[PDB]
Amino acid sequence: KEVVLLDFAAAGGELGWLTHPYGKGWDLMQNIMNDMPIYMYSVCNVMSGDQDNWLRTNWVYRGEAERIFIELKFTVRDCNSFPGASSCKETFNLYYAESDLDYGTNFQKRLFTKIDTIAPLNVEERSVGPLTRKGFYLAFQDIGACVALLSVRVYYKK
Amino acid sequence: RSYVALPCCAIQASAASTLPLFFAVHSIHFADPNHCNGVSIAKLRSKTGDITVETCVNGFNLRSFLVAVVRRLGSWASQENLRLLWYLQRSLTAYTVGFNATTADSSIHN
Amino acid sequence: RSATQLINGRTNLSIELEFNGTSFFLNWQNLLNVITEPALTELWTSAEVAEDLRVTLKKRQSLFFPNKTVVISGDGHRYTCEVPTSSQTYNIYSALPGHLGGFGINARLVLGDIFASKWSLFARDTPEYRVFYPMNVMAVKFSISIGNNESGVALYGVVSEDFVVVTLHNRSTASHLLFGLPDSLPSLKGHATYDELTFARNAKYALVAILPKDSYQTLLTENYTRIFLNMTESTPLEFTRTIQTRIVSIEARRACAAQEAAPDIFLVLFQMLVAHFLVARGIAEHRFVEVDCVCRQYAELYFLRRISRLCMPTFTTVGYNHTTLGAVAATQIARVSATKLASLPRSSQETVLAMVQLGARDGAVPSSILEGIAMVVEHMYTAYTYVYTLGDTERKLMLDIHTVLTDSCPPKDSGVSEKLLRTYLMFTSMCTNIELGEMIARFSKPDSLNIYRAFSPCFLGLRYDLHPAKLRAEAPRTAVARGTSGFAELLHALHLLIPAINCITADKIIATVPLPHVTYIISSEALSNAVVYEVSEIFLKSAMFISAIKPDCSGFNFSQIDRHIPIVYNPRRGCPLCDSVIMSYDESDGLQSLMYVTNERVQTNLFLDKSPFFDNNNLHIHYLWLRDNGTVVEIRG
Ligand SMILES: *[C@@H]1O[C@H](CO)[C@@H](O[C@@H]2O[C@H](CO)[C@@H](O)[C@H](O)[C@H]2NC(C)=O)[C@H](O)[C@H]1NC(C)=O
Ligand SMILES: *[C@@H]1O[C@H](CO)[C@@H](O[C@@H]2O[C@H](CO)[C@@H](O)[C@H](O)[C@H]2NC(C)=O)[C@H](O)[C@H]1NC(C)=O
Ligand SMILES: *[C@@H]1O[C@H](CO)[C@@H](O)[C@H](O)[C@H]1NC(C)=O
Ligand SMILES: *[C@@H]1O[C@H](CO)[C@@H](O)[C@H](O)[C@H]1NC(C)=O
Ligand SMILES: [Cl-]
Ligand SMILES: [Cl-]
Ligand SMILES: [Cl-]
Ligand SMILES: [Cl-]
Ligand code: NA
Ligand code: NA
Ligand code: NA
Ligand code: NA
Ligand code: NA
Ligand code: NA
Ligand code: NA
Ligand code: NA
Ligand code: NA
Ligand code: NA
């Protein structure tokens, strides 16, 4: 079983995702673990207050997928590990949005449905279904947290 | 490049040959002796394209490098340069009083 | 690719504390302006910031950390070369303030002569790179290499204006010794800081020892507090002289090329560098310096360097030049004439000799200085004949004379070279049986031996029999084994034929006696163009031949039909012994003493109880009279 439509950790850094605040907020970052390059999307604007930092995945062609599972592997830095502005959070938000075509760099928060709040290496899994349009995007919203998202894999069973 | 999501890191054997040039480093991030299991590590943040590169480096060696750099400023060393120098000296001795085999082991932060 | 390209409009290198929240900043442009881009690159590469922490731990555990820094509350010794308001000062050439160097000069130029060339230190391929960051300093470099590249050791050090660093490398890991200003010592690397490696400390100077735990045990057990006290609380002059004594001690043990005692040679090198450093620091810490005082210091330093090179021939020094001070000394010594030099007090003529050392130009001592040396030695020898002893002050004067005479081009004029032959002959006349015994006794106790007591007229003599077997035969506890050897060692290195008489000999010469009108060669065999005398009543293997040659290589008027030495029997009523030589020899041990009879008082003092001649209690000694016309007789009765 488990047919994988998207796997960020297996992309080897050749998969770039959209960031609505470009520069601030989410950033694509490389580290080296066990002498191999491990990539992640990380954000940590904790001492700044209002944030609303969005990270949108590439377009994922649906295919035969009707009920998909989203598996997030991520780390959250403890808010008490900062000398502060006590407006930081320890969760983020997972959204998705279906479309028959690839919109590209066009990003509209209006079209994205909130899947769930992701809170505590943290391994979370959510389910979405049924999907009807030709493809879908995932989205991650930061509201003032210190998160390093290392793996995102979407798949369907059998 | 103000706050890092993974403040603790493991020093990799491949880093010695793929170190970024000094003029390519955007920022240096030092840890605490009260963090990262006492392990004296640090993070260089450089950048290639969209990718901010984070390199895990030796805390003692980087602190001594910065000490050497500040000491060669001489008369031109400003107030903030000397405050940096004193942080470096104090944190060097602090990491030195607790330098152990447990403390040289940074692989735990993998 | 370029550093400016990599910076890319980034004003600051930011340094964040991840858990404190404060940030430091280094201006990129200011870093580049103050510290050049090559220097930044080299520091960054040498830092090895990606080195694994276990390697750093192993590096740190490999060191020896002292108990606790010992702080001496003093400031060292006071500067002895300070200019009193009783003398003049000059900034900087015909302006000649007399002689003897009793004035002062601005030290800005003489300081620039010491540190005139820069050197890059702690380079990538070097072992000191393991602990120091590479740096460029104005300095003077010293380097000794003892043994082959597979088994030997390499000692090398650097004296800069602010510190001294010396390194011992066991393959020709390394040991390091530093001395200087605590805030100016070269930047260390991660695994060690300077406070924990500081053994002794002054209010101005500090001593640091970065020694591996497996290094030479003597370096680890060495008491660096005593070393620091002997380095700082004595004037640099007497300290330099103690280092000269230690070099002499190394010479007397045949340890100049021994792999063993390499840490001892390392300590001696460290101390010599510290002496140079302290003299230079005295030069820098004062706006004006006293000429004669600094010339004395420089002369002691140069003698230390030269005697160290004599011991270890691989000893190399690059940097310590004295061109301007040498020109000052050249102006000072050009006034001194022979009678002037000979009438000066012993200390003042020692100062003159020091300035002659420094102001030698192209290795040419002025003829006036040589004639004055002849007169000084003449007075010294005439006075010696009264007590047949020599004080340490007179031996120090002889050491200065020997330092001046060596490395001096031979005299061009005939008369001055003849007078030099005369003073050489007088030095031989002071190297008698008593002197050989005394020197053996002195060298038998190397602890109480110092640089003055270790010097003897034999070093400037025309005796060539002074070999370990002969000296063994000339000695009077069981330390005679050492005393005879070490002396011989120091005789082989500090001794000195190039004058006159070319009319065909070998190296089988026992002694050379140059009288005004005839020259005697005491040799193992006869000579062609000579009047030969076969020495009688001597052992077969000690056999001697006294060959008399005239300087113009002409023959004599008398013609012996036999090479026997006639015998005469039975003080003086005039001076029959003037311009002659009285020579004693032992029936089994050959030549014992020989004395040139310069005047009437030498003649009459030859018959004193402490004289090395006419001892009736000796049943196997023979006395020969070598006259100026070529005749040789034997004195008996
Ligand atoms: C190393 O040498 C120093 C030379 O001063 C010794 O220090 C002195 O030792 C004497 C006794 O031997 C004391 O009375 C002094 O008070 C000491 N002076 C200082 C400044 O410490 C020192 O003891 C020697 N170390 C060893 C291990 O022998
Ligand atoms: C060389 O000089 C010596 C003196 O130094 C001469 O010795 C004299 O010899 C004659 C007869 O041989 C004696 O009558 C004198 O009394 C000797 N003088 C002294 C002072 O003892 C010797 O004759 C000279 N030889 C030659 C060849 O001229
Ligand atoms: C080193 O120090 C740490 C304290 O941070 C301690 O827990 C550890 O047991 C020590 N290791 C050794 C080998 O002494
Ligand atoms: C750089 O640091 C200086 C102080 O060292 C500060 O005045 C300046 O604002 C900083 N600039 C930036 C861009 O961080
Ligand atoms: Cl990418
Ligand atoms: Cl990855
Ligand atoms: Cl955390
Ligand atoms: Cl501060
Ligand atoms: Na991106
Ligand atoms: Na796109
Ligand atoms: Na960090
Ligand atoms: Na570099
Ligand atoms: Na501490
Ligand atoms: Na560079
Ligand atoms: Na050196
Ligand atoms: Na005169
Ligand atoms: Na005397
Ligand atoms: Na000899």
Author numbering:
A (entry chain E): 27 to 110, 112 to 147, 163 to 200
B (entry chain L): 19 to 128
C (entry chain H): 35 to 126, 132 to 211, 217 to 520, 527 to 546, 551 to 557, 560 to 626, 630 to 696
Quote the paper.
Human herpesvirus 8 (HHV-8) is an oncogenic virus that enters cells by fusion of the viral and endosomal cellular membranes in a process mediated by viral surface glycoproteins. The membrane fusion process is mediated by the envelope glycoprotein B (gB) and the noncovalent heterodimer made of glycoproteins H and L (gH/gL), which constitute the conserved core fusion machinery of all herpesviruses. One of the cellular receptors hijacked by HHV-8 to gain access to cells is the EphA2 tyrosine kinase receptor, and the mechanistic basis of EphA2-mediated viral entry remains unclear. The physiological ligands of Eph receptors are membrane-tethered proteins called ephrins (acronym for Eph family receptor interacting proteins).
We report here a 2.7-Å resolution X-ray structure of the HHV-8 gH/gL ectodomain bound to the LBD of EphA2 together with results of structure-guided mutagenesis and cell-based studies. The tertiary complex forms an extended structure 15 nm long and around 4.6 nm across its widest part, in the gH region. The EphA2 LBD and gH/gL form an intricate interface structure made of a 7-stranded mixed β-sheet containing strands contributed by all 3 proteins. gL binds to the EphA2 LBD via its N-terminal segment (residues 21 to 30) and residues from its β2 and β3 strands. The full list of contact residues is given in S2 Table and is represented in S6 Fig. The gL N-terminal segment is restrained by C26 and C27 that form disulfide bonds with C74 and C54, respectively. Immediately upstream this anchoring point there is an elongated, hydrophobic “tail” (residues 21 to 25) that inserts into a hydrophobic channel formed by the EphA2 strands D and E and gL strands β2 and β3 (the “roof”). Below the gL “tail,” the single gH residue that makes contacts with EphA2—E52gH—forms a salt bridge with R103EphA2, clamping the bottom of the tunnel (the “base”). The HIEphA2 loop is well ordered and forms the DIN, while the JKEphA2 loop, which carries a short J′ helix, is not resolved in our tertiary complex structure, likely due to its already reported structural plasticity and/or displacement by gL. The GHephrin-A1 loop, which is the principal interaction region with the EphA2 receptor, occupies the same space as the gL “tail,” while the salt bridge established between the conserved R103EphA2 and E119ephrin-A1 is replaced at the same location by a salt bridge between R103EphA2 and E52gH. But contrary to the many interactions provided by gL we show, in addition, that the only gH residue involved in contacts with EphA2 LBD—the E52gH—is critical for the high-affinity interactions between HHV-8 gH/gL to EphA2, with the Kd in subnanomolar range.
